[PDB]
Design an enzyme around this catalytic site. Structure first.
Site, PDB file in Angstrom:
ATOM      1  N   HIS A   1       7.209   4.881   3.774  1.00  0.00           N
ATOM      2  CA  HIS A   1       6.426   5.486   4.857  1.00  0.00           C
ATOM      3  C   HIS A   1       6.631   4.803   6.163  1.00  0.00           C
ATOM      4  CE1 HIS A   1       2.254   7.538   5.586  1.00  0.00           C
ATOM      5  NE2 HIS A   1       3.008   7.640   6.667  1.00  0.00           N
TER       6      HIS A   1
ATOM      7  N   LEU B   1     -12.685   4.033  -7.153  1.00  0.00           N
ATOM      8  CA  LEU B   1     -12.173   5.045  -6.192  1.00  0.00           C
ATOM      9  C   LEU B   1     -11.229   6.067  -6.859  1.00  0.00           C
ATOM     10  CD1 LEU B   1     -11.717   2.975  -2.929  1.00  0.00           C
ATOM     11  CD2 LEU B   1     -13.186   4.887  -3.209  1.00  0.00           C
TER      12      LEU B   1
ATOM     13  N   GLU C   1       1.660   3.208  -1.814  1.00  0.00           N
ATOM     14  CA  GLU C   1       1.911   3.568  -0.409  1.00  0.00           C
ATOM     15  C   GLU C   1       2.447   2.321   0.278  1.00  0.00           C
ATOM     16  OE1 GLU C   1       1.870   4.741   2.416  1.00  0.00           O
ATOM     17  OE2 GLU C   1       1.775   6.883   2.227  1.00  0.00           O
TER      18      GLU C   1
ATOM     19  N   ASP D   1      -8.878  -1.485  -2.700  1.00  0.00           N
ATOM     20  CA  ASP D   1      -9.723  -2.326  -3.567  1.00  0.00           C
ATOM     21  C   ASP D   1     -10.609  -1.380  -4.326  1.00  0.00           C
ATOM     22  OD1 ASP D   1     -10.794  -4.679  -4.760  1.00  0.00           O
ATOM     23  OD2 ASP D   1     -12.103  -5.139  -3.122  1.00  0.00           O
ATOM     24  N   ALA D   2     -11.300  -1.881  -5.333  1.00  0.00           N
ATOM     25  CA  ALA D   2     -12.131  -1.033  -6.113  1.00  0.00           C
ATOM     26  C   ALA D   2     -11.305   0.139  -6.737  1.00  0.00           C
ATOM     27  CB  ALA D   2     -13.340  -0.567  -5.323  1.00  0.00           C
TER      28      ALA D   2
ATOM     29  N   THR E   1      -5.380  11.344   4.147  1.00  0.00           N
ATOM     30  CA  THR E   1      -6.366  10.285   4.349  1.00  0.00           C
ATOM     31  C   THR E   1      -7.381  10.718   5.406  1.00  0.00           C
ATOM     32  OG1 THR E   1      -4.591   8.675   3.953  1.00  0.00           O
ATOM     33  CG2 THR E   1      -6.685   7.820   4.696  1.00  0.00           C
ATOM     34  N   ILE E   2      -6.895  11.365   6.461  1.00  0.00           N
ATOM     35  CA  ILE E   2      -7.814  11.858   7.471  1.00  0.00           C
ATOM     36  C   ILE E   2      -8.815  12.905   6.965  1.00  0.00           C
ATOM     37  CG2 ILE E   2      -7.799  13.194   9.542  1.00  0.00           C
ATOM     38  CD1 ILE E   2      -4.979  11.550  10.152  1.00  0.00           C
TER      39      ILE E   2
ATOM     40  N   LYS F   1      -5.283   5.921  -0.243  1.00  0.00           N
ATOM     41  CA  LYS F   1      -4.755   4.604   0.153  1.00  0.00           C
ATOM     42  C   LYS F   1      -5.701   3.472  -0.227  1.00  0.00           C
ATOM     43  CE  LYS F   1      -1.824   6.832   3.744  1.00  0.00           C
ATOM     44  NZ  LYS F   1      -1.572   6.824   5.131  1.00  0.00           N
TER      45      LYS F   1
ATOM     46  N   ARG G   1       2.779   6.193  11.280  1.00  0.00           N
ATOM     47  CA  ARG G   1       2.567   7.061  12.421  1.00  0.00           C
ATOM     48  C   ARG G   1       2.442   6.228  13.668  1.00  0.00           C
ATOM     49  NH1 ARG G   1      -1.035  12.031  11.565  1.00  0.00           N
ATOM     50  NH2 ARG G   1      -1.163  12.692  13.768  1.00  0.00           N
TER      51      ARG G   1
HETATM   52  O1  LIG Z   1     -20.799  -7.921  -2.691  1.00  0.00           O
HETATM   53  P1  LIG Z   1     -19.901  -6.797  -3.196  1.00  0.00           P
HETATM   54  O2  LIG Z   1     -20.463  -5.869  -4.236  1.00  0.00           O
HETATM   55  O3  LIG Z   1     -18.519  -7.284  -3.610  1.00  0.00           O
HETATM   56  O4  LIG Z   1     -19.619  -5.759  -1.974  1.00  0.00           O
HETATM   57  C1  LIG Z   1     -19.153  -6.255  -0.733  1.00  0.00           C
HETATM   58  C2  LIG Z   1     -17.670  -5.915  -0.633  1.00  0.00           C
HETATM   59  O5  LIG Z   1     -17.202  -6.389   0.657  1.00  0.00           O
HETATM   60  C3  LIG Z   1     -17.426  -4.409  -0.873  1.00  0.00           C
HETATM   61  O6  LIG Z   1     -18.097  -3.558   0.070  1.00  0.00           O
HETATM   62  C4  LIG Z   1     -15.968  -4.115  -0.749  1.00  0.00           C
HETATM   63  O7  LIG Z   1     -15.511  -3.712   0.427  1.00  0.00           O
HETATM   64  N1  LIG Z   1     -15.222  -4.198  -1.743  1.00  0.00           N
HETATM   65  O8  LIG Z   1     -13.871  -3.887  -1.457  1.00  0.00           O
HETATM   66  O1  LIG Z   2       4.506  14.136   8.775  1.00  0.00           O
HETATM   67  P1  LIG Z   2       3.299  13.383   9.212  1.00  0.00           P
HETATM   68  O2  LIG Z   2       2.434  14.096  10.218  1.00  0.00           O
HETATM   69  O3  LIG Z   2       3.615  11.953   9.570  1.00  0.00           O
HETATM   70  O4  LIG Z   2       2.226  13.256   7.921  1.00  0.00           O
HETATM   71  C1  LIG Z   2       2.632  12.668   6.668  1.00  0.00           C
HETATM   72  C2  LIG Z   2       2.081  11.241   6.475  1.00  0.00           C
HETATM   73  O5  LIG Z   2       2.534  10.787   5.199  1.00  0.00           O
HETATM   74  C3  LIG Z   2       0.536  11.225   6.676  1.00  0.00           C
HETATM   75  O6  LIG Z   2      -0.054  12.123   5.770  1.00  0.00           O
HETATM   76  C4  LIG Z   2       0.058   9.847   6.484  1.00  0.00           C
HETATM   77  O7  LIG Z   2      -0.349   9.453   5.295  1.00  0.00           O
HETATM   78  N1  LIG Z   2       0.137   9.044   7.434  1.00  0.00           N
HETATM   79  O8  LIG Z   2      -0.295   7.721   7.163  1.00  0.00           O
HETATM   80 MG   LIG Z   3      -0.950  11.048   4.109  1.00  0.00          MG
END
Ligand SMILES: O=P(O)(O)OC[C@H](O)[C@@H](O)C(O)NO
Ligand SMILES: O=P(O)(O)OC[C@H](O)[C@@H](O)[C@@H](O)NO
Ligand SMILES: [Mg+2]
Ligand SMILES: [Mg+2]
EC number: 4.1.1.85
Lengths: 214, 215
Positions: free
Chosen positions: B135, B71, B111, B66-67, B35-36, B63, B138
């Site tokens: 999980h 995504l 997750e 929404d959407a 994710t990072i 992770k 962290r």
């Molecule tokens: O007005 P929308 O197209 O729904 O977009 C705003 C909404 O908050 C999105 O950025 C979003 O985070 N959807 O998860």
């Molecule tokens: O072994 P770690 O350094 O905790 O990394 C694994 C973990 O699943 C991360 O990738 C993560 O998604 N933390 O939210």
């Molecule tokens: Mg991870």
């Protein structure tokens, strides 16, 4: 004062976002780097948009689920004002992100998309969280979920607990009257501004109707 | 079957990630775009890592909250094999991601970081989710949350429901015996491999211990 207007840049590339900001950057108060843009371009999106619009509040809609100190710091080092942390994050995730936000004089919003509880809301408050995003999921919307009185009741309740509340989720101009009488911090519009035949008219009409209603 | 080993690339830049993959690509089964790294570099991290290592399973740890369809599709068009969806996401978010995953012969994991319920877990199964990531956050870890008996019981119960379960969250070699006897699908290590004096040897140790504990 008046509820602010936030534009959501849910674009996959910076150039696609700029098609929108070049029309309406000065027509809104907050410029959101949407989750889609965070994933598409990474935190460069944050750095770039703030460099362009330093007088605007820039929100990084990262929807942080874990690693709150690390992800928050990346967004803040990129000059974010505000970051989002998803409601089901461990409470220590929210705390961590909030600690880093304080170093940079920014802020954290808890993103209330999907499942969460009133007990967690209390926990956020005790941790020092002052903003929440009450959010009808895009995917819930597409499955036919409408805004309704239970949402209004929930927003009022969050407001009474002390949170500044943002409202979002496929908002149209016509939707604004549902929230009348509540001290809403921000309304977000993504599609209803970006995808309008006239994005400038769309944003000015949101701002006009907000002025009318509050 | 032996639990597989997934390395988490929780790096802020591609070059930092490569400092790890050049050593351990061949020592692990799944390469996770952490994710990072997704947030640091964007979905290009997915496309580039797959291009370097196309024979390996590449997981985009987005992770998604929404959407789901949008995504998911970004990740899959970047050649991801697996994507993650956060457990609190509306059920249509998971469904949306899964539909897209099926177009690309991919898959979705839920997750389990943060709070969730057993009825929700059933909803995931009914929607056709086959994988969950148990999980320990962290940040929970940092605040002293330890692995324990409650985690064993929940993992076994997830497995009995039909999920392949991945276990993660600051795992060290010493934690693996906690899970002995359970058909764990994948163990993830990020820090324990990336930050070791010898990443190669750290990965090899994990593999040796796994082969002993599940052999
Ligand atoms: O007005 P929308 O197209 O729904 O977009 C705003 C909404 O908050 C999105 O950025 C979003 O985070 N959807 O998860
Ligand atoms: O072994 P770690 O350094 O905790 O990394 C694994 C973990 O699943 C991360 O990738 C993560 O998604 N933390 O939210
Ligand atoms: Mg991870
Ligand atoms: Mg957004």
């Amino acid at each position: 004062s008046l509820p602010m207007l936030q534009v959501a840049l849910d674009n996959q590339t910076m150039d696609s976002a700029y098609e929108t900001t070049r029309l309406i950057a000065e027509e809104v108060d907050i410029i959101e780097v949407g989750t889609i843009l965070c994933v598409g371009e990474g935190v460069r999106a944050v750095r770039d948009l703030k460099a362009l619009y330093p007088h605007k509040i820039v929100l990084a809609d990262a929807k942080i689920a874990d690693a709150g100190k690390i992800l928050s710091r990346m967004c803040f080092e990129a000059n974010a004002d505000w970051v989002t942390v998803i409601c089901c994050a461990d409470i220590n995730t929210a705390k961590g992100a909030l600690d880093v936000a304080k170093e940079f004089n920014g802020d954290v919003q808890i993103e209330l998309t999907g499942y969460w509880t009133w007990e967690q809301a209390q926990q956020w408050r005790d941790a020092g969280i002052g903003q929440v995003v009450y959010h009808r999921s895009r995917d819930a919307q597409a499955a036919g979920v409408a805004w309704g009185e239970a949402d209004i009741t929930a927003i009022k309740r969050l407001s009474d607990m002390g949170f500044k509340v943002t409202v979002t989720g496929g908002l149209a101009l016509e939707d604004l009257p549902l929230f009348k009488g509540i001290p809403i911090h921000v309304f977000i519009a993504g599609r209803s501004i970006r995808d309008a035949a006239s994005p400038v008219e769309a944003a000015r009409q949101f701002k006009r109707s907000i002025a009318e209603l509050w």
